[PDB]
Subunit: 119 residues, 4 copies
């Protein structure tokens, strides 16, 4: 079983810590990004998500509520057991910016990947 | 203030119900999709997310843990007050499939939009 | 129907003109966006793409090489013929911004949708 | 450097060959994917794209018109020259599947990334 509980680093140098996974697959955590729109403002930020409970390589999603920006990032992906029996999260993300008017919604969503491994 | 609490329908005919938003911006809810990979299997499914607390048009994210599939969808977007003072969620989503091997990860992530309004 | 040749408008109010589609489904065109990072700078920009040639509701893609910034957008989608014979392009796009250092690559790609129908009226 | 002309391999083991880039930054090429929805069907497929012409680390896009399915992929990204002069394409893609009814459009677009470097060895 691959599970999300524990400390992770992604390929950008960001680190996150994910707490215990409950009976419904729910979890909370913290995220410290290495990169940002304004790197001088980066603070620790909370995350909340759900993983599938029974699968050995479960898919999951989480939302990061950035404490230094009006932006939100969502991550979704799959917790894999790699060739060496080590856990790897392959994720894709959407980074949503706050726009002042619905008419500028088109500009507001960045997309990307991240690979996480244990710290 | 636009907030997520309440009942919503999206442009595909899906409906969701979002509970009270807590002091940290956290919320839970339910989702009944009108469309699916296998429509004959569609069951009510739970969601969990975070919205920014203080903004009048906050950004948010949520994860839907599908009860009839190993897939997960994440939604992120912004809660807008439209020209008539009505609430509209403009969202983008990533639909993550479960793949059996890390080598097939490339195939696993669909992307799309949804507009939600009150039921 | 669903030859991309012609004039099209999207939901944001951008216009595009696509030329003849050749035997290989290849086409060029021009694009006038209604929105941009720096909207004061907007100028007509060229596109190049390919559609599937024999499909009645073909998928397709094209690239817009913006002439007023260092960005590039690609669109991909499908031309549908609706229950009234009306052509509708449903597209998704990626808008790539130029960054200088590979370590900033993560920041550089936006995603979105557009719906296009043929320009309704002539000048 | 960062003329797209040449042979490239991505992280999935696909290969592509891009021809001369013209004065407008336009190029054609061929693509042999290492992976597919139906991998038994894979055949060489044409591409067409545009890169920014004067930028040293240009952004670009291209469309692949798959010859063995009704799908289309677009790639967009940026050619970087790393601290050793090595060229690296960092791309994101959208892969559009054909559906029959507009009401199924929501299901039809996948998203992903690829990293390309020039083919290292000749046959
Ligand atoms: O700058 C912001 O607007 C908030 C922080 C965003 C950090 C992003 S989330 C996706 C990517 N992966 C990371 O590890 N950090 C960046
Ligand atoms: O079929 C599945 O794999 C699970 C259900 C996915 C339903 C998707 S989520 C994005 C889109 N918006 C909706 O309202 N439903 C579909
Ligand atoms: O801002 C730029 O540098 C180039 C213009 C980008 C315009 C984008 S492309 C996707 C979206 N759809 C449009 O019609 N215009 C915007
Ligand atoms: O499956 C198909 O019908 C067409 C082939 C799709 C291959 C995709 S395109 C994006 C990804 N990168 C590759 O090198 N190949 C896959």
């Amino acid at each position: 079983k691959c599970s999300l509980t524990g400390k992770w680093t992604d390929d950008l140098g960001s680190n996150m810590t994910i707490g215990a996974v409950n009976s419904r697959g729910e979890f909370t955590g913290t995220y410290i990004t290495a990169v940002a729109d304004n790197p001088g403002n980066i603070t620790l930020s909370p995350l909340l998500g759900i993983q599938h409970k029974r699968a050995s390589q479960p898919t999951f999603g989480f939302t990061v509520n950035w404490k230094f920006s009006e932006s939100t990032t969502v991550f979704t992906g799959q917790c894999f057991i790699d060739r060496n029996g080590k856990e790897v999260l392959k994720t894709m993300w959407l980074l949503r910016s706050s726009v002042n008017d619905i008419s500028d919604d088109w500009i507001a969503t960045r997309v990307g990947i991240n690979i996480f491994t244990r710290q």
